[PDB]
């Protein structure tokens, strides 16, 4: 492939460099339209800018935490982090978010990796290997109430059991209801006067719930869960302007008030170098 | 003697002529078309009013003055009250449509000024409150009036800050969306053909707007000496290939 | 070799090697030739 | 107020004109539908799509 | 049940009216059934809210 | 096992079943069809909303009692407010349509009574004043309510005398018009298909009604002993092959 | 596979929607027996409702 | 590839792709045609 062809002096009536940008086109002008060039080859394919590659590496999408401790006398397991959940979503952590929102609709399979590490803040003894249970709780399923409810039987709901310190990995097909996931949605769930506006209405993909299977030892053990997400088989439509201001909320476009100028002011003139 | 410059668009029972055009943009290089069976889901036969809905509606005019910040209309909202297009809209459960948008602004060879005319698929607005305040329905359904970016923040309304496109992105990059400029010195109209763009084959016309049309002054209007300091901008829009499905009782929407 | 039955379980896809910027860079209705005048 | 064979019976009144016999929304996973076999199976899945057949037998 | 995803309503009204023969009286009833058309799709299995328990059963 | 007796008519998104029919009449043995070019005059392409206008609208119910004289509806008037049919009607300059009329009245094998259901093309009514008094507009445009032949003379209204068909002809000869009887002992519905009948290819839908549908008790209703002395009669009507042409601003009509 | 075929107006002596449930059958009635439909395809096989799948986790 | 000798040790079965509701939806002795009268 040639990156530049050889081109010499020109004295024409045919001027490729004068255009009318009002038309909305970006005319494909090249170095050889306005200087004299020599042949050179590309030596490159643009492999690593493919959208599959761009969205295809694992990104941290969520960090939560649960603890193993005596539940005796706990009136609210959920509240003691005896188990915890996560209202699945991919917009909470914002590094991966800016990348996805370069597109309007996106379609992909997900590969999740879950790393779980333990911490023993209060001076301790022997730690017996804890086994985490991650179970997917889709919309309209008995949400779990204690850390050892019938829910955890999970007879119809996919769940994975792995050890703290290890990693769990599995992959979920594209579960969207439509043909693509909306990265943006300028609509409502119905024409009410006070119903929420955004995608949050569109993206209720249910929550994921974690717990330790082990009963309690004499000390307490903090287990912190990190969920990583990798898009595989990516398809993206309609590019948009990149995010300039900071994010404030999952699912709304809102930016913070009295934010700071995002364009760097010159130290000098327009004329400055 | 054909110029890129003169054009005629006849759609239904209405025709537009421009003698000072700058080509026309067809979003994503695709022209509006009906919904193919292979893509269909709802089993209902759809209704295609054709020429009674696919004609040109001219919205009320705006006034560009030296202080203007820009205006924003949403589709199909802007047309919610135009003739039979609008009736069909409130009466069917689902509908689908593409449009021809023609924005008009003429001046003289002594004026200067340049407007950006852009179509943004799925333009989800931001609340000026920050945090996770929502933007109430009425605020994103201004109707033919559209939203005036130089109007004041209101409560439950969107933010109207132009350098941020009403969503946290910079004005400068709106050029990645199908758009055309109106530069008084060149141009006097802008025309964009919009194919139907959605993640579902057909949708509700009232709970979801699928494009915002935005006209934004970028190089300020400058009139000749002792000229009146303003020009009107007119927007005429025509639904094209419209289909309605799931007819019934007639939606009632807030406000 | 796929070891698994479902398609979601396969590895990343392979390069589009599609690449056609004209839907974005030249969505004009009447074709513009480089070198010919923009507005006739 | 307690489950009874009677909640399967939709009553009809002689001589009423213009009036309404019954009403329900169509949340097949809840409400009237929920204990029916259809309702009962739908509940093992997250998403549904398709046509429903509703019939009335007169007695 | 979800809003965005909601399916409509079903109602029934007298078109003319029920008329009983002589020597007859009172209410008559309709039985109503529901089943899915061959059209139907269900996907993404999960657990039913329709059954739960507090201790394991025994014999 | 097909009987003349059971029938199903599906039109648009609406279906009717009768288990006690007496065949169906198709006026003048012709079925509604669109307007052919060879017969066309107006050069405008017409709009054919199809399934959104060609469905069944059930008008409000009447009550046959022993004192009833008969009721009269005009078309397209009776439908002037039904869904999108009606909107189209007020919004185009010209329109054209055929209809399926289904009149319903069920009783038991102890009742007796017989209604005449007849369609009269161009039913010009008479003033009860005599002389050359006219019948004002409002009076001949009752809408879905229709005209109740047992109501009182009003001023500017038509005469409501049944032995004279509201025009100086005898009830007995209405049988020369497409018609069907509903005899409680036989029948429970009447169905008539009306092709478009006019002296022009397309006309105005508001200044001219082209058929009156008339339901007239002829053998008085007789209920079984200690039965309630009345039965409701319901009329359901569906526009078929409708076409509208000459779209614009939306007619404003008296009252 | 078609999920719905195209079907238009009907004025028949052949009524598929009137049945006798006393018989114990569920007659296979479809949208196209009582409204006007357009063609649409299934795009689906019913894979995840197979009893092997239902009892297999 | 089965690594084991016994049939019980193989993975899940594969979709019946059988599907015939008529034993449940139409177990009537004399065949009913849709459109023909239910009771003659
Ligand atoms: C946009 C957008 C895209 C996504 C991701 C959707 C992923 C589908 C649901 O995700 C899961 C997560 C976890 C599990 C799980 N099953 C057993 C353990 O974890 C299943 C599906 O979220 N927002």
- The CATH code of the domain that includes B104 is 2.60.120.20
Which residue, among A127, A154, A112, A96, has the nearest Cα to A219 in the 3D structure? A127
- For ligand 1, is residue A161 a contact (CB within 6 Å)? no
Q: What is the distance between the alpha carbons of residues H35 and A164, in angstroms, rounded to a whole number? A: 64
CA of A169 to the centre of ligand 1 (A): 12
What token pair was written down for F43? 């050069």
Beta bridge partners of B8: B17
CA of F209 to the centre of ligand 1 (A): 62
- For ligand 1, is residue A199 a contact (CB within 6 Å)? no
Residue F122 to chain D, least CA–CA distance (Å) = 31
Mutate to test the interface with H, among G27, G46, G48, G55 (most CBs of H within 10 A): G27
* Domain total in chain H: 1
Residues 2-41, chain E: which have Cβ within 8 Å of D?
6-14, 16-20, 27-37, 39-41
Beta bridge partners of A159: A135
Q: What is the distance between the alpha carbons of residues A154 and E47, in angstroms, rounded to a whole number? A: 7
Which of A59, A62, A85, A88 most suits a substitution to test ligand 1, by most atoms within 8 Å of the C-beta? A88
- For ligand 1, is residue A208 a contact (CB within 6 Å)? yes
Give the DSSP H/E element, type plus range, for residue F7. strand F7-11
| Cα-trace Rg, chain G | 16
- For ligand 1, is residue A185 a contact (CB within 6 Å)? no
For chain A, give the number of residues: 273
CA of A112 to the centre of ligand 1 (A): 8
Running DSSP on this structure, what letter comes out for residue A94?
A: H
Q: What is the distance between the alpha carbons of residues B42 and F205, in angstroms, rounded to a whole number? A: 33
Q: Which atom of ligand 1 is nearest to the CA of A88?
A: 22
CB under 8 Å to D1, separation ≥6 — which residues?
Answer: none
What token pair was written down for H13? 């079965």
Which residue, among B1, B4, B2, has the nearest Cα to B191 in the 3D structure? B4
- The CATH code of the domain that includes H28 is 4.10.80.10
Q: What is the distance between the alpha carbons of residues B181 and B183, in angstroms, rounded to a whole number? A: 6
Residue pair F179/F185 in contact by the 8 Å Cβ criterion: no
Contacts of H36 in chain G (CB under 8 A): 14
For residue H35, the chain G residue with the least C-alpha distance is: G16
Burial B189-205, CB ≥16 within 10 A → b, else e: bbbbbbbbbbbbbbbbb
Q: Which atom of ligand 1 is nearest to the CA of A229?
A: 5
Structure determination technique employed = X-ray
Q: What is the distance between the alpha carbons of residues C24 and C22, in angstroms, rounded to a whole number? A: 5
- For ligand 1, is residue A172 a contact (CB within 6 Å)? yes
Would you call F37 helix, strand, or coil by DSSP?
A: helix
Phi, psi of A180 (to 5 degrees): -145, 165
Would you call F49 helix, strand, or coil by DSSP?
A: coil
* Start-end of H helices in A91-155: 94-100
What token pair was written down for A62? 């969520």
| Residue A175 sits at the chain E interface (C-beta within 8 Å) | yes
- For ligand 1, is residue A228 a contact (CB within 6 Å)? no
For residue B249, the chain F residue with the least C-alpha distance is: F83
CB under 8 Å to F68, separation ≥6 — which residues?
Answer: F150, F217, F221
CA of A176 to the centre of ligand 1 (A): 10
- For ligand 1, is residue A112 a contact (CB within 6 Å)? yes
* Start-end of H helices in chain A: 51-55, 94-100
CA of A174 to the centre of ligand 1 (A): 8
Number of neighbours of residue B100 by Cβ within 10 angstroms:
21
Give the DSSP H/E element, type plus range, for residue F65. strand F62-65
CA of A223 to the centre of ligand 1 (A): 21
Q: What is the distance between the alpha carbons of residues F23 and B103, in angstroms, rounded to a whole number? A: 59
Q: How far lies A21's CA from each of A24, A170, A215, B100, F6, in Å? A: 6, 49, 69, 20, 70
Contacts of F45 in chain B (CB under 8 A): 50-51
Residue A88 burial class via C-beta count within 10 angstroms: exposed 0-12, middle 13-18, buried 19 and up:
buried
Contacts of A249 in chain B (CB under 8 A): 131-132
How many angstroms separate the first and last alpha carbons of chain A? 36
Contacts of E40 in chain D (CB under 8 A): 48-51
What token pair was written down for B124? 């989800």
What token pair was written down for D59? 């007695």
Range of the domain at C1: 1-40
Q: What is the distance between the alpha carbons of residues G30 and G20, in angstroms, rounded to a whole number? A: 17
Running DSSP on this structure, what letter comes out for residue B100?
A: E
Residue pair B138/A193 in contact by the 8 Å Cβ criterion: yes
User: Do the chains contact at E49 and A142, CB–CB below 8 Å?
Assistant: yes
For chain F, the helix, strand and coil percentages under 3-state DSSP, each to the nearest 5 = 15, 35, 50
Residue F63 to chain D, least CA–CA distance (Å) = 9
What token pair was written down for B44? 């209902």
What token pair was written down for A37? 């060039």
Would you call F21 helix, strand, or coil by DSSP?
A: coil
Residue nearest to atom 14 of ligand 1 (CA): A136
Range of the domain at B34: 1-255
Contacts of G36 in chain B (CB under 8 A): 44-45
Q: What is the distance between the alpha carbons of residues A256 and B133, in angstroms, rounded to a whole number? A: 11
Burial B112-130, CB ≥16 within 10 A → b, else e: ebbbbbbbbbbbbbbbbbb
User: Do the chains contact at C16 and A50, CB–CB below 8 Å?
Assistant: yes
* Domain total in chain B: 1
Mutate to test the interface with G, among D51, D54, D58 (most CBs of G within 10 A): D51
Q: What is the distance between the alpha carbons of residues F13 and F15, in angstroms, rounded to a whole number? A: 7
CA of A110 to the centre of ligand 1 (A): 7
For residue B22, the chain A residue with the least C-alpha distance is: A23
Residue pair A203/A88 in contact by the 8 Å Cβ criterion: no
The HSE-up count of residue B228 (CA atoms within 13 Å, CB side) is 6
Would you call E13 helix, strand, or coil by DSSP?
A: strand
CA E49 to chain centre: 17
Resolution to 1 decimal place, in Å: 3.0
Question: What one-character-per-residue DSSP string does B176-244 give?
Answer: GSSEEEEETTT-SEEEEEE----SSSSB-SSSB--EEEEEEEEEEEEPPTTS-SEEEEEEEEEEEEEEE
Which residue, among B204, D53, G28, F60, has the nearest Cα to E10 in the 3D structure? D53
Would you call D41 helix, strand, or coil by DSSP?
A: helix
Domains and CATH numbers, chain A: 1-273 (2.60.120.20)
CA A61 to chain centre: 6
């Amino acid at each position: 492939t040639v990156a530049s062809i050889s081109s010499g002096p020109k004295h024409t009536q045919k001027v490729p460099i004068l255009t009318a940008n009002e038309t909305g086109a970006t005319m494909p002008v090249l170095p050889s339209d306005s200087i004299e060039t020599r042949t050179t080859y590309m030596h490159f394919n643009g492999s690593e800018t493919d959208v599959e590659c761009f969205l295809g590496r694992a990104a941290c999408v969520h960090v939560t935490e649960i603890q193993n401790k005596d539940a005796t006398g706990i009136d609210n397991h959920r509240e003691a982090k005896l188990f915890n959940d996560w209202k699945i979503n991919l917009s909470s952590l914002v590094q991966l978010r800016k990348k996805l929102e370069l597109f309007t609709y996106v379609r992909f399979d997900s590969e999740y990796t879950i790393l779980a590490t333990a911490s023993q803040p209060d001076s301790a003894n022997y730690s017996s290997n804890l086994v985490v249970q991650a179970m997917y709780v889709p919309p309209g399923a008995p949400n779990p109430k204690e850390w050892d409810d019938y829910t955890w039987q999970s007879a119809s709901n996919p769940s994975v059991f792995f050890k703290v310190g290890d990693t769990s990995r599995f992959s979920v097909p594209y579960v969207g209801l439509a043909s693509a996931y909306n990265c943006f949605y300028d609509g409502y769930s119905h024409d009410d006067a006070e119903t929420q506006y955004g995608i949050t209405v569109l993206s209720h993909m249910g929550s994921m719930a974690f717990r330790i299977v082990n009963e309690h030892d004499e000390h307490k053990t903090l287990v912190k869960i990190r969920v990583y997400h990798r898009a595989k088989h990516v398809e993206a439509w309609i590019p948009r302007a990149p995010r300039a201001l900071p994010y404030t909320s999952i699912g709304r476009t809102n930016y913070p008030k009295n934010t700071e100028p995002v364009i760097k002011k010159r130290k000098g003139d327009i004329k400055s170098y | 003697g054909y110029s890129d410059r003169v054009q005629q668009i006849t759609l239904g029972n209405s025709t537009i002529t421009t003698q000072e055009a700058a080509n026309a943009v067809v979003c994503y290089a695709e022209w509006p078309e009906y919904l193919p069976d292979v893509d269909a889901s709802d089993v209902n036969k759809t209704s295609k009013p054709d020429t009674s809905v696919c004609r040109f509606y001219t919205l009320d005019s705006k006034t560009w003055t030296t202080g203007s910040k820009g205006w924003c209309w949403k589709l199909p909202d802007a047309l919610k009250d135009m003739g039979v297009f609008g009736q069909n809209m409130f009466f069917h459960s689902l509908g689908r449509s593409g449009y021809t948008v023609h924005v008009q602004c003429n001046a003289t060879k002594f004026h200067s000024g340049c407007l950006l005319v852009v179509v943004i698929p799925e333009h989800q607005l931001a609340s000026h409150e920050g945090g996770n305040v929502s933007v109430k329905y009425t605020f994103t359904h201004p109707g033919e009036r559209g939203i005036d970016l130089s109007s004041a923040n209101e409560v439950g309304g969107p933010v109207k800050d132009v350098l941020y496109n009403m969503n946290g992105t910079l004005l400068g990059n709106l050029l990645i969306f199908p758009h055309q400029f109106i530069n008084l010195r060149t141009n006097n109209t802008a025309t964009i053909v919009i194919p139907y763009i959605n993640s579902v084959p057909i949708d509700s016309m009232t709970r979801h707007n699928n494009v915002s049309l935005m006209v934004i002054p970028i190089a300020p209007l400058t009139v000749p000496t002792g000229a009146t300091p303003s020009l009107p901008i007119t927007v005429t829009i025509a639904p094209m290939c419209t289909e309605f499905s799931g007819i019934r009782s007639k939606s009632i929407v807030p406000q | 070799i796929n070891y698994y039955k479902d398609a979601a379980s396969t590895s990343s896809a392979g390069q589009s090697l599609s690449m056609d910027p004209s839907k974005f860079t030249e969505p004009v209705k009447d074709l513009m030739l480089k070198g010919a005048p923009a507005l006739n | 107020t307690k489950d009874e064979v009677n909640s399967y019976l939709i009553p009809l009144n002689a001589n009423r004109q213009n009036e309404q016999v019954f009403g329900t929304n169509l949340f097949i996973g809840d409400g009237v539908f929920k204990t029916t076999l259809l309702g009962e199976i739908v509940q093992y899945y997250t998403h549904w799509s398709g046509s429903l057949r509703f019939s009335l037998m007169y007695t | 049940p979800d809003t965005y995803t909601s399916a409509g309503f079903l109602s029934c009204w007298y078109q003319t009216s029920l008329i009983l023969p002589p020597e007859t009286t009172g209410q008559v009833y309709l039985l109503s059934f529901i089943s899915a058309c061959p059209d139907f799709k269900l996907r993404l299995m999960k657990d039913t809210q329709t059954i739960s328990q507090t201790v394991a059963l025994t014999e």
